Design a binder for these strands. Structure first.
Ligand SMILES: [Mg+2]
Ligand SMILES: [Mg+2]
Ligand SMILES: [Mg+2]
Ligand SMILES: [Mg+2]
Ligand SMILES: [Mg+2]
Ligand SMILES: [Mg+2]
Ligand SMILES: [Mg+2]
Ligand SMILES: [Mg+2]
Ligand SMILES: [Mg+2]
Ligand SMILES: [Mg+2]
Ligand SMILES: [Mg+2]
Ligand SMILES: [Mg+2]
Ligand SMILES: [Mg+2]
Ligand SMILES: [Mg+2]
Ligand SMILES: [Mg+2]
Ligand SMILES: [Mg+2]
Ligand SMILES: [Mg+2]
Ligand SMILES: [Mg+2]
Ligand SMILES: [Mg+2]
Ligand SMILES: [Mg+2]
Ligand SMILES: [Mg+2]
Ligand SMILES: [Mg+2]
Ligand SMILES: [Mg+2]
Ligand SMILES: [Mg+2]
Ligand SMILES: [Mg+2]
Ligand SMILES: [Mg+2]
Ligand SMILES: [Mg+2]
Ligand SMILES: [Mg+2]
Ligand SMILES: [Mg+2]
Ligand SMILES: [Mg+2]
Ligand SMILES: [Mg+2]
Ligand SMILES: [Mg+2]
Ligand SMILES: [Mg+2]
Ligand SMILES: [Mg+2]
Ligand SMILES: [Mg+2]
Ligand SMILES: [Mg+2]
Ligand SMILES: [Mg+2]
Ligand SMILES: [Mg+2]
Ligand SMILES: [Mg+2]
Ligand SMILES: [Mg+2]
Ligand SMILES: [Mg+2]
Ligand SMILES: [Mg+2]
Ligand SMILES: [Mg+2]
Ligand SMILES: [Mg+2]
Ligand SMILES: [Mg+2]
Lengths: 46, 271
RNA sequence: CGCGGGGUUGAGCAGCCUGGUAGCUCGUCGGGCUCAUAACCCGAAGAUCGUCGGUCAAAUCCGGCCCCCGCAACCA
RNA sequence: GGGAGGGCGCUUACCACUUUGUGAUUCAUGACUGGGGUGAAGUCGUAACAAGGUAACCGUAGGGGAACCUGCGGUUGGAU
RNA sequence: AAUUCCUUGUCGGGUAAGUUCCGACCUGCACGAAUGGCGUAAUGAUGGCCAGGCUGUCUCCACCCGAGACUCAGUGAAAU
RNA sequence: GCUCGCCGGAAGACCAAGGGUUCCUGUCCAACGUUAAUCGGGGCAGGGUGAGUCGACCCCUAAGGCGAGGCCGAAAGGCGUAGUCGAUGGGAAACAGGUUAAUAUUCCUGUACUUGGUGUUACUGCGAAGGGGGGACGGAGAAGGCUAUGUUGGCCGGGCGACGGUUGUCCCGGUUUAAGCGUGUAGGCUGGUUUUCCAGGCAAAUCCGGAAAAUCAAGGCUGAGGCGUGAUGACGAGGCACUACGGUGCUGAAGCAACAAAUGCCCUGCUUCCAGGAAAAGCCUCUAAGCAUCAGGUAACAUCAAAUCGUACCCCAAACCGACACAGGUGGUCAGGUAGAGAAUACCAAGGCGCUUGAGAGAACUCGGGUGAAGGAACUAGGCAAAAUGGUGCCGUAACUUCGGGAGAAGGCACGCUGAUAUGUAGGUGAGGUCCCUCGCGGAUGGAGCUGAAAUCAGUCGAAGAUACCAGCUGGCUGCAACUGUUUAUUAAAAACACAGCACUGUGCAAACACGAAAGUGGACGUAUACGGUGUGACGCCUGCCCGGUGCCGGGAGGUUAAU
RNA sequence: AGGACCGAACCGACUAAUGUUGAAAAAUUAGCGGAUGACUUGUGGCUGGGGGUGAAAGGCCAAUCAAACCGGGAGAUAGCU
RNA sequence: AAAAUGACA
């Protein structure tokens, strides 16, 4: 059975990447929540 | 000619092909080709706005000259060609100065014939000259709406337009739909009647014969569910409703025209 | 065996619609035209309202009864 | 001493009886059904024979309980 | 009848025996003409019935070969 | 170490995606390993990835994203022009061998090639954002020439048999060599050269386009393979010795022909068909402004530079997605022998594994299989399941029909081995000879060797010769749906949905309709033979009566009637 | 030539059996349908919740769908256990 | 304008 996670680095950084967060007003507030909470690694960008 | 395929397969029984040997069987003229990308019915927002569109075969748009703005300068018809973007074969046209274009094909055009446009051109099938110079009671095609716009009326396969009367600065036309219009007497109108008239006499034969044309299947509203289509519902083929488009508007009778700005150009509504 | 609609001169159909008031078409009878029968014309007769019971009065208002025509008897 | 040759036995070839599988044709028989014929004062009508009371008929098409009726063309084997 | 309650309607075929099946009757509770009618060769992992071959499906089970099930050594769950 | 067994279109070998030390040594068995463990993809420590040519980077674009100004929108914001990003596509160059415990088209040896800067010369009109050319494109089918590759023969090296034979038509092994450079074949496309003129290629143009005239029957482009050369080199069985006994060092013969042959190459080719089959850059050419000293361009010569990042390892799995060392999922590339039409199946080679609990016993009962007396659907909701047929050639084959079908209908016959026809035929292949020759990678003639079906006759063995795996069950009547297709991922695959066809109706282009507070966009770079909605569902014969009710269309007199 | 025929790769899922605290949160075994097309597959894009998409089953939208997931209104309300 | 029918011997 073909599972629901077929990983792909290029599609992960194009969608949940940092520069994906910065390009939209709603995404920019997503980071400001993570920084305020005090998260170690913010988005996904390994 | 219309040729009926022999029933060697259940799905080739009812195939009638309109085949024209005279169509050139090489490659189209290279400098007149551009890229043509499908949409599948999707627009800016990415949602479908016209249904049953998608798939098909990759095609290339050919730059058909609709305006026909070359006064003087006779030309010859080099060859006839098959245009997938339309219903009427096109013709490659070579002018005396060495310029090549594409034009639509009147029914009485072969390879090697000679045409020319302008207000002084002769009255023969293929020439373009303003409807002011065109004699009344004639049968024309590729008609315009505004002087120099390019031409919209009577462009499909086998259709034409009758010129009924010439009143002052306006000319009255009877269209192929039965409606009567008035257009400004300075519109150009290529003289003739569009070719490939056997385009009715064809039956695609099978489902794939339409699927490979950019036509996706349509699903009747009586099969849908009540939340998808107004007809919907029913335990065993019940209707009980006045026929309606999926958006609630009435079909099957309801007039839905409103311009109020070009109504001054209509003589008799189609009937 | 719960709920409707109905029983009218020989046939079909009104009058029951707020209680005095019985009609229409066909049909039966007696004459008339015809050689004669149909057809047509002129005249007549025929029901007390399904039954048994309950106000000055009853086809009508009410109940039982007899018969007919209908609908509804479902969830497991 | 045996040899040549022959018979018996075995074996192959041809073929009768017989057994299969599919057809063709012919003869009876079959619930029900189509038309036809005959029969007694039956029922509904009156199509045709006269100008048969809408002249008849031929081909074709549609309709009707039935004779039949109507459209289109054709003939005189129609009266005045 | 994918439609017919009474109904296993009645007659015929098939079977020793046929509420199913095929043909016919019409008494259509409650078929019927593009929410289409009646036919139709080919097609179908579609619904119903019949026949030939075939067989442990069955009368009625018997034997045999392998993995388990049982004993010894190691590790060692779960529902309640 | 010796046997046995299994996969062998894979359970073998190599990649992209993905993972991130899992790779190699030494060392340890507390924990992880469904058991023990000296073992491990475990703990600890050390080691390991070498690039002008392979990729990424880089130049160019598709779908599409972002979008200076801008248009639009209560604010956020939406769309979009010039531009600029985006490969799953286009653009320069390296091959053979040797070596490490671990890397190698990356190091070493040998032999190459590509693009830039600079310098020396010899020539020279150079010059772009613009003109043109090319890059540049589909599906099917058919042969023809080849190669990889395999079989056989020769040659070389070795051998004379554990038990009857085996100095011979006997047995085993080897018979390999690249990129590059020259040559230009089988073939495939196109006529070339020159001269004069021109309303077109937004300006110009000697280039494309077009119009004329002469001339010659030739020229040019493309092109797999073959043959030289690289290579009197490397490789090479096996012998010689050290053996730390893991392997290491020395030497080294033959290294040729025939036949068969691809799904790979010529082939982006040829023929044919309708459903008519990406864009831009690299590259060639023409000129404008501009420079005519220069500058710049063409060719040879010498030198310099080619930076940065990946390079271990698993990659159909114990290292990826499934919570696990999980009977699941995962795109591409290579394709040996025998029998076979085959990438099916059966047995094998190269290679890799025996699937991380065993040892006993031989009860019931369950799971997976084998055979069965006589009967053959009597069981059952129902022939569910088992059983059965199963190949090639030939004979033969009905009702019905849209003339194609039905049909592989049904039902039958032959099939192994040896010999003769023929000391292997028909056919395919084709060496020396021989002649001609535009003399070459030629053309005829020429049949040595090689390979090789199919058939007939006769004999022969078994119970059985498509002997194994592989491999149709067949007829009769009937409802529904014309047919191939699609559907409830995970209880419903159908009579449901779709379909080609038919009908009604809307729609005159700034179209109807749809997404959207709007701008705008799909419809469509389409124009009534077109497009949208609705119903029916191939084909044949058909589609009767009702406009009272509910809608819809037309009407414009009369009545009723809102804001003002 | 064929939405032509038989049949492996490939795609699918008609029947029976086992499994139902499985090897597997839908598979294995023996059979089965399509296999030049309305086919199948790799990479990258687009459409977003009363919205998408749908050869139409209320199917599918991260093991969830007659209206997803996460946070907030929120200690909603509960004549009910 | 309407205008039908009449066993057999
Ligand atoms: Mg349609
Ligand atoms: Mg439905
Ligand atoms: Mg609704
Ligand atoms: Mg119904
Ligand atoms: Mg008469
Ligand atoms: Mg008459
Ligand atoms: Mg019977
Ligand atoms: Mg134990
Ligand atoms: Mg094996
Ligand atoms: Mg580690
Ligand atoms: Mg342990
Ligand atoms: Mg380790
Ligand atoms: Mg770029
Ligand atoms: Mg934008
Ligand atoms: Mg801006
Ligand atoms: Mg790429
Ligand atoms: Mg070879
Ligand atoms: Mg390695
Ligand atoms: Mg696994
Ligand atoms: Mg294991
Ligand atoms: Mg796969
Ligand atoms: Mg195999
Ligand atoms: Mg046992
Ligand atoms: Mg058995
Ligand atoms: Mg037995
Ligand atoms: Mg027996
Ligand atoms: Mg038997
Ligand atoms: Mg029984
Ligand atoms: Mg029985
Ligand atoms: Mg079975
Ligand atoms: Mg079997
Ligand atoms: Mg039935
Ligand atoms: Mg079907
Ligand atoms: Mg199907
Ligand atoms: Mg399902
Ligand atoms: Mg299913
Ligand atoms: Mg339908
Ligand atoms: Mg139908
Ligand atoms: Mg009708
Ligand atoms: Mg097929
Ligand atoms: Mg097949
Ligand atoms: Mg599926
Ligand atoms: Mg789900
Ligand atoms: Mg809700
Ligand atoms: Mg609150």
């Amino acid at each position: 059975m073909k599972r629901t996670f077929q990983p792909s680095v290029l599609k992960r950084n194009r969608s949940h990447g940092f520069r994906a967060r910065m390009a939209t007003k709603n995404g920019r507030q997503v980071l400001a929540r993570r920084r305020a909470k005090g998260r170690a690694r913010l988005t996904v960008s390994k | 000619a219309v040729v009926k395929c022999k029933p060697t397969s259940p799905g080739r029984r009812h195939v009638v092909k309109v085949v024209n040997p005279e169509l050139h069987k090489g490659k189209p003229f290279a400098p007149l080709l551009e890229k043509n990308s499908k949409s599948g019915g999707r627009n800016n927002n990415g949602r479908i706005t016209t249904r049953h569109i998608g798939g098909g075969h990759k095609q290339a748009y050919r730059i058909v000259d609709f305006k026909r703005n070359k006064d003087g300068i006779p030309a010859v018809v080099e060859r006839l060609e098959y245009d997938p973007n339309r219903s009427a074969n096109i013709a490659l046209v070579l002018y005396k100065d060495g310029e090549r274009r594409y034009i639509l094909a009147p029914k009485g055009l072969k390879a090697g014939d000679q045409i020319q446009s302008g207000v002084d051109a002769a009255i023969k099938p293929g020439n373009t000259l303003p409807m002011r110079n065109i004699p009344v009671g004639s049968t024309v095609h590729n008609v315009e709406m505004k002087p120099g716009k390019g031409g919209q009326l009577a462009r499909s396969a086998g259709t034409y337009v009758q010129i009924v009367a010439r009143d002052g600065a306006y000319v009255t036309l009877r269209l192929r739909s039965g409606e009567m219009r008035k257009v400004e007497a300075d519109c150009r109108a290529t003289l003739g009647e569009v070719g490939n008239a056997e385009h009715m006499l064809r039956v695609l034969g099978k489902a794939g014969a339409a699927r490979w044309r950019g036509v996706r299947p349509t699903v009747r509203g009586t099969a849908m569910n009540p939340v998808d289509h107004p007809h919907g519902g029913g335990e065993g083929r019940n209707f009980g409703k006045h026929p309606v488009t999926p958006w609630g508007v009435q079909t099957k009778g309801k007039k839905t025209r409103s311009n109020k700005r070009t109504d001054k150009f209509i003589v008799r509504r189609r009937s």
